[PDB]
């Protein structure tokens, strides 16, 4: 799998732990608590990882049939679908809506699947901390390029294409080297994107992690800064995570299900997906919906 040019010197972390499932009684009880917590909280940051794209047929890294998990035990990973053909999940779409109605301040993602951007989620409210298969970036001028198809390298290599930006004075092409945005093991995170995520998570008062085992830093430690500054922390993940001890609420369920219940408890529709819609800037906020009902 790192015949794709990447480092074989990586700490894959703890792979292949067994999946816990909350029984359906305790789940419903818990998701209700989350819904109250969302509505009740002013600034709410979400943290996504590979676990929210599993439903679309993209494997996780450290699950029972994760990429690293399978490599670590001598086996070919198993891809169901491609990155192009992969379709946003209920969670991807629920997240989109939660932004539209101001119930989500910021989104922090470790996923390189490109599907947050393709879900329609506004890029200016998203830090893609480990990169995006579809985004390439000019080395000279920093300008990014969201593509229809993958840029075709990883590890911050050059993709063999040049920057088409014509500059303010002169207006002749920049012609810098375009490179992928996919971080390799121990590559530095993106300055802008980490800064915004860091700020978002400090000043957030609810952090909700969805489908990450929280083993890779600094990404996986941002949800903790929320707590150190007096906030709450919800951890939605099937497996246990590295920071389970610090969670105000752990939920061990499918993330599509949790969000599906959450959006009902908040009385909100989960959009369908028309197809890939790159949205650079968030639209004007919709008005905040009716107050949630209490538990029946």
């Amino acid at each position: 799998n790192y015949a794709a040019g990447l480092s074989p010197y990586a700490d894959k972390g703890k792979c292949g732990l067994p999946e816990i499932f909350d029984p359906p009684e305790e789940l419903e009880r818990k998701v209700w608590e989350l819904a109250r917590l969302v509505w009740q909280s002013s600034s709410v940051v979400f943290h996504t990882g590979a676990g929210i794209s599993t439903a679309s047929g993209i494997p996780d890294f450290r699950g029972p049939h994760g990429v690293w998990t399978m490599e670590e035990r001598g086996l070919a990973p198993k891809f169901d679908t491609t990155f192009e053909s992969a379709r946003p999940t209920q969670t991807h779409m629920a997240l989109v809506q939660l932004e539209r109605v101001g119930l989500l301040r910021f989104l922090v993602s470790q996923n390189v699947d490109g599907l947050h951007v393709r879900s329609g989620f506004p890029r200016d409210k998203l830090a893609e901390l480990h990169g995006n298969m579809f985004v390439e970036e000019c080395a000279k001028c920093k300008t990014q390029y969201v593509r229809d198809t993958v840029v075709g390298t990883m590890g911050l290599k050059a993709t063999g294409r040049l920057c088409t930006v014509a500059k303010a004075r002169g207006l002749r092409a920049c012609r810098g080297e375009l490179r992928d945005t996919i971080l390799d093991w121990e590559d530095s995170l993106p300055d802008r994107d980490l800064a915004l995520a860091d700020e978002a998570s400090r000043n957030a008062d609810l952090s909700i992690t969805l489908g990450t085992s929280l083993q890779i830093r600094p990404s996986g430690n941002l949800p903790l800064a929320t707590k150190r500054r007096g906030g709450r922390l919800v951890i939605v993940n099937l497996q246990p995570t590295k920071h389970d001890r610090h969670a105000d609420l752990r939920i061990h369920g499918y993330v599509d299900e949790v969000m599906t219940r959450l959006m009902k408890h908040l009385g909100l529709e989960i959009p369908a997906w028309d197809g890939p819609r790159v949205l650079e800037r968030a639209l004007p906020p919709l008005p905040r919906p009716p107050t949630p009902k209490l538990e029946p």
């Binding site: 972390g13 390799d184 093991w185 590559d187 530095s188 995170l189 830093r217």
Partner: peptide, 8 residues
């Protein structure tokens, strides 16, 4: 310089 790793 904030590197993607596991820290150990």
């Amino acid at each position: 310089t904030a590197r993607k790793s596991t820290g150990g």
